[PDB]
Design an enzyme around this catalytic site. Structure first.
Site, PDB file in Angstrom:
ATOM      1  N   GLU A 176      -6.034   9.455   0.908  1.00  0.00           N
ATOM      2  CA  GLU A 176      -6.350   8.036   0.853  1.00  0.00           C
ATOM      3  C   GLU A 176      -7.432   7.653  -0.149  1.00  0.00           C
ATOM      4  OE1 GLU A 176      -5.223   5.037   2.309  1.00  0.00           O
ATOM      5  OE2 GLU A 176      -3.503   6.117   2.834  1.00  0.00           O
ATOM      6  N   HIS A 225       0.838  -1.206   0.000  1.00  0.00           N
ATOM      7  CA  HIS A 225       0.000   0.000   0.000  1.00  0.00           C
ATOM      8  C   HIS A 225       0.880   1.267   0.000  1.00  0.00           C
ATOM      9  CE1 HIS A 225      -3.024   2.914   1.439  1.00  0.00           C
ATOM     10  NE2 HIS A 225      -2.181   3.242   2.407  1.00  0.00           N
ATOM     11  N   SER A 285      -4.248   1.088  -4.261  1.00  0.00           N
ATOM     12  CA  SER A 285      -3.718  -0.165  -3.751  1.00  0.00           C
ATOM     13  C   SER A 285      -4.811  -1.182  -3.518  1.00  0.00           C
ATOM     14  CB  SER A 285      -2.921   0.027  -2.429  1.00  0.00           C
ATOM     15  OG  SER A 285      -3.749   0.485  -1.378  1.00  0.00           O
ATOM     16  N   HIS A 336       0.949   5.337  -2.029  1.00  0.00           N
ATOM     17  CA  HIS A 336       1.374   6.684  -1.645  1.00  0.00           C
ATOM     18  C   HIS A 336       2.573   7.284  -2.390  1.00  0.00           C
ATOM     19  CE1 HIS A 336      -1.118   7.410   1.894  1.00  0.00           C
ATOM     20  NE2 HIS A 336      -0.943   6.147   2.245  1.00  0.00           N
TER      21      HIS A 336
HETATM   22  C1  LIG Z   1      -2.281   6.623  11.756  1.00  0.00           C
HETATM   23  N1  LIG Z   1      -3.578   7.282  11.273  1.00  0.00           N
HETATM   24  C2  LIG Z   1      -4.743   6.393  10.837  1.00  0.00           C
HETATM   25  C3  LIG Z   1      -4.280   5.132   9.985  1.00  0.00           C
HETATM   26  O1  LIG Z   1      -5.352   4.217   9.849  1.00  0.00           O
HETATM   27  C4  LIG Z   1      -3.760   5.540   8.581  1.00  0.00           C
HETATM   28  C5  LIG Z   1      -3.222   6.857   8.393  1.00  0.00           C
HETATM   29  C6  LIG Z   1      -2.720   7.236   7.164  1.00  0.00           C
HETATM   30  C7  LIG Z   1      -2.731   6.342   6.081  1.00  0.00           C
HETATM   31  O2  LIG Z   1      -2.208   6.767   4.895  1.00  0.00           O
HETATM   32  C8  LIG Z   1      -3.266   5.017   6.202  1.00  0.00           C
HETATM   33  O3  LIG Z   1      -3.241   4.173   5.071  1.00  0.00           O
HETATM   34  C9  LIG Z   1      -3.788   4.609   7.469  1.00  0.00           C
HETATM   35 FE   LIG Z   2      -2.154   5.048   3.584  1.00  0.00          FE
END
Ligand SMILES: CNC[C@@H](O)c1ccc(O)c(O)c1
Ligand SMILES: [Fe+3]
Length: 308
Positions: free
Chosen positions: A214, A169, A233, A174
């Site tokens: 996201e 992912h 992803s 990202h």
């Molecule tokens: C730590 N904050 C929430 C977490 O579930 C989280 C934060 C950012 C992301 O890009 C992700 O895929 C998941």
């Molecule tokens: Fe993420």
């Protein structure tokens, strides 16, 4: 009183003693729960992240054949969708990641090489993260163009599924967007808006992050494509987000900030960004409404936050 926030890039080191100690791999629900080798492997990556300090090269890890196989499956299945489903900025950089970073089915890229590549493009860097950071600490790192990144991979039994972020992912979802200058500036503005913000506003910025970084969609001429890391992803949801099923709304932060979302099913609705420059402007204005007894600016020459 005003919550503490890091003032120099080195202070992000303080975050390692503030993560959730009992990770998702310990839940009976996790695909690797009954696998003691997986369990030990996750602890190994957690210790690497725990001891990491800003400025050090990120430790290289030799991945096992079983882990490379999982990566391969994910990579090959998702790659077929990018040319038609991903925003232009993603497709523009992908070929370069394949050439200089070893993004290929047979090899899991090492974070140090990927971090060096991001530094050359936009000054973003990665640091390995043990477990779950609070939204406050996670978003605060973005203010310094620092992305906390997982280094472990999901369990091999369910290659197309992960209940948490993992290396597939991070790298396929990202990394490509952080190589874009406007996306980098946009992400950083979210981070700057979070510094010293009250808890209730951090949750509003976390929601905005969810609906952009996201699960965001981009307007591209007369078309709509995906730029959200969670979509890029997820084989199933990336195809679903561009079909007739979901409701699409224009990104309007006063509205996005309070929208509820599910973490377990495809999103019923998505917000469409006009462009990353525009989203950046909207966050900056939204940030002005956050009650903070001060103003902040990042000085890239010294890597310090200036409190006005
Ligand atoms: C730590 N904050 C929430 C977490 O579930 C989280 C934060 C950012 C992301 O890009 C992700 O895929 C998941
Ligand atoms: Fe993420």
């Amino acid at each position: 009183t005003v919550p503490w926030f890091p003032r120099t890039i080195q202070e992000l080191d303080r975050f390692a003693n503030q993560i959730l100690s009992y990770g998702a791999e310990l839940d009976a629900d996790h695909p690797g729960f009954k696998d003691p080798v997986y369990r030990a492997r996750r602890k190994q990556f957690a210790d690497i992240a725990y001891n990491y300090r800003h400025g050090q090269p990120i430790p290289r890890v030799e991945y096992m054949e079983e882990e490379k196989k999982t990566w391969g499956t994910v990579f090959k299945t998702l790659k077929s969708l990018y040319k038609t489903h991903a925003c232009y900025e993603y497709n523009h950089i992908f070929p370069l990641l394949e050439k200089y970073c070893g993004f290929h089915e047979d090899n899991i890229p090492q974070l140090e090489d990927v971090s060096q590549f991001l530094q050359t493009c936009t000054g973003f860097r990665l640091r390995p993260v043990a477990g779950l950071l609070s939204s406050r600490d996670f978003l605060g790192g973005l203010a310094f163009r620092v992305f906390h990144c997982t280094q472990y991979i999901r369990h091999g039994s369910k290659p197309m599924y992960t209940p948490e972020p993992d290396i597939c992912h991070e790298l396929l979802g990202h990394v490509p967007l952080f190589s874009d200058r406007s996306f980098a500036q946009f992400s950083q503005e979210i981070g700057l808006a979070s510094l010293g913000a009250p808890d209730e506003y951090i949750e509003k910025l976390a929601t905005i992050y969810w609906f952009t970084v996201e699960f965001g969609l981009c307007k591209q001429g007369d078309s709509i494509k995906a730029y959200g890391a969670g979509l890029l992803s997820s084989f199933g949801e990336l195809q679903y987000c561009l079909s007739e099923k979901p409701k699409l709304l224009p990104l309007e932060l006063e509205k996005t900030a309070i929208q509820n979302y599910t973490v377990t099913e495809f999103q019923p609705l998505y917000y469409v960004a006009e462009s990353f420059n525009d989203a950046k402007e909207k966050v900056r204005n939204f940030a002005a409404t956050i009650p903070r007894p001060f103003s902040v600016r990042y000085d890239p020459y010294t890597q310090r936050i200036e409190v006005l």
